[PDB]
Design a protein around this ligand. Structure first.
Ligand code: FES
Ligand SMILES: [Mg+2]
Ligand SMILES: [Mg+2]
Ligand SMILES: [Mg+2]
Ligand SMILES: [Mg+2]
Lengths: 45, 46, 105, 92, 161
RNA sequence: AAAAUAGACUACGAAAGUGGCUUUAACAUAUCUGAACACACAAUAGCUAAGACCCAAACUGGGAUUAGAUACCCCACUAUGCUUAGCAACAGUUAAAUCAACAAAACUGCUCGCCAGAACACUACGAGCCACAGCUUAAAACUCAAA
């Protein structure tokens, strides 16, 4: 049962990281992400 | 002194000319590196 | 540097011993060596039985070859000694006279 | 006062004595000398408490004995009978 | 480049009459028939003559830097062949760090000699980092995005004006 | 494959460690302190590809045994053992009254790290690293008068 909790936490962590990254370029004025940018999945093998 | 000693010694070296003569002279000779020591530290030549 | 080759050769007749010595010294010179002297220590019974090139030996002729060679030659020369069939055992060492005789007191 | 003692190193001290082999060259080809420091019955190398040699000369003799044994100059399991009549320099 | 093998040993270069000897004696007294250490000594004196003001002074910082540079080159040459020699890897790294420290001291004390050493030995002096912190994945990705966003915003600002 | 004597030696190396012989390279640094986060090593067992397999042997089977047999004896054979390719420091003093106790005679100077009752807690959460087991950093609430 510790597993499913652990990957759930990893998913929420990835979502938080993506939200912070999005906040950056939204505050910078860019409507979308930088051209050719794709957020990598850094918390999953 | 070392350079002069080497220059003198190089005369009597085994070149490719005197190879056969020196080989035969060696085969017609024997040298001994064996000596003994006494309690008094004296070298007893065979 | 200066090296000494201790060569234990097969117990052979004089022409064969001379031919083997000539071949060894020629190999030494071919590998860049200046041979200084050749000395015969005599033919004697080996301290133990030595097997070489699928033959068993109990006697041998002992020779010393003093020479100067580049450091890269020694390894090469060793390999040559491994192939010669008339050499029971060939060993290259740094010449004993080069080591300094520090005088204890 | 001239009768006072003076600072000085111990003048009665006996200097450390030199060993039999100090000042002499040890050669691996000199099987006669190297045979004076091995057991006649087993060929084992005698220690410094038997040979009486210094540490440096003991090490040189050991190295020469091993070198001569493997270069085909000296027997390993026994002392060569040709050298059994040599002067005895070992306290055994 | 190494000295030619025909060069005479450092101890046999100023002896009088060394040019009047047989070719065999010249070979016997050349780098060809010596160990690598004599070649390293020849390299060292060549560097001293080419760089330092007084080639006889060996206690100076620049002379020590030259000696350590020759030694570092020898270790690198050794390690090209013995890839699994860990002790010599340690010696090489320690020597490089020590030479960096000596170069820093030389820079702080004598700038002209520092420049001459850096040119002569081909050493490119580098400054130390200011902050020592772990650059984990999140930080690296965030920094890359921030650089990209700055680039895009600069393009937008330039075009819009 | 690992190296009787030497070695009653105490040497080399940062440590781990290094004891057959020869040869070639070769053993950093002219002050000290000062990295979890950098780079090298180290020992620790276990996995991923292959290969070898005499012998041994976790597990898995079979044989024999009291009256829950022998857990223990016998046979056979796996993973594995093997071979590559990889993942307090430093510098001084013995002068003082030596000094809770036991350890290991006491102290000074200077610097770094760490500690402020017990348990909760080599824990939870967060973060980093990895990823079958996880490792590092590391709390709070309740409780007690002790530990
Ligand atoms: S007395 Fe000189 S080495 Fe022993
Ligand atoms: Mg320090
Ligand atoms: Mg410290
Ligand atoms: Mg934990
Ligand atoms: Mg928390």
């Amino acid at each position: 049962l510790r597993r499913k909790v652990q990957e759930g936490r990893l998913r929420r962590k990835q979502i938080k990281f993506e939200k912070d990254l999005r906040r950056i370029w939204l505050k910078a004025g860019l409507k979308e992400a930088p051209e050719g940018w794709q957020t990598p999945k850094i918390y999953l093998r | 002194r070392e350079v002069l000693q080497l220059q003198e010694e190089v005369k009597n070296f085994i070149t490719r000319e005197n190879l056969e003569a020196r080989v035969e002279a060696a085969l017609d000779s024997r040298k001994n590196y064996n000596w003994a020591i006494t309690r008094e530290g004296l070298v007893v030549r065979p | 540097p200066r090296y000494e080759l201790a060569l234990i050769l097969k117990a052979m007749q004089r022409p064969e011993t001379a031919a083997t010595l000539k071949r060894t010294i020629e190999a030494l010179m071919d590998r860049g060596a200046i041979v200084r002297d050749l000395e015969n220590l005599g033919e004697r019974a080996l301290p133990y039985r030595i097997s070489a090139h699928s033959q068993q030996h109990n006697r041998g002729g002992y020779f010393l070859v003093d020479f100067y060679a580049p450091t890269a030659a020694v390894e090469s020369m060793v390999e040559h000694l491994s192939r010669d069939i008339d050499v029971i055992r060939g060993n290259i060492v740094k010449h004993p006279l080069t080591q300094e005789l520090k005088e204890c007191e | 006062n001239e009768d006072l003692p003076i600072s000085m190193e111990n003048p009665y001290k006996e200097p450390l004595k030199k060993c039999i082999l100090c000042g002499k060259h040890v050669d691996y080809k000199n099987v006669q000398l190297l045979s004076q420091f091995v057991s006649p019955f087993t060929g084992c190398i005698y220690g410094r408490h038997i040979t009486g040699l210094c540490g440096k000369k003991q090490k040189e003799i050991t190295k020469a004995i091993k070198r001569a044994q493997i270069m085909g100059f000296m027997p390993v399991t026994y002392k060569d009978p040709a050298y059994l009549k040599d002067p005895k320099v070992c306290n055994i | 480049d190494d000295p030619p093998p025909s060069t005479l040993l450092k101890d046999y270069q100023n002896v009088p009459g060394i040019e009047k000897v047989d070719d065999v004696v010249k070979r016997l007294l050349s780098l060809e028939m010596a160990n690598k250490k004599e070649m390293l000594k020849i390299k060292q004196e060549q560097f001293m003559k080419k760089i330092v003001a007084n080639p006889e002074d060996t206690r100076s910082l620049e002379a020590r830097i030259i000696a350590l540079s020759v030694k570092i080159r020898s270790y690198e040459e050794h390690l090209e062949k013995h890839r699994k020699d860990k002790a010599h890897k340690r010696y090489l790294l320690m020597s490089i760090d020590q030479r960096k420290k000596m170069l820093k001291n030389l820079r702080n004390t004598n700038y002209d000699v520092f420049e001459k050493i850096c040119w002569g030995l081909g050493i490119e002096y580098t400054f130390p980092p200011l902050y020592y912190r772990r650059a984990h994945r999140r930080f690296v990705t965030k920094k890359a995005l921030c650089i990209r966003v700055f680039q895009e915003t600069q393009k937008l600002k330039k075009r819009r004006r």
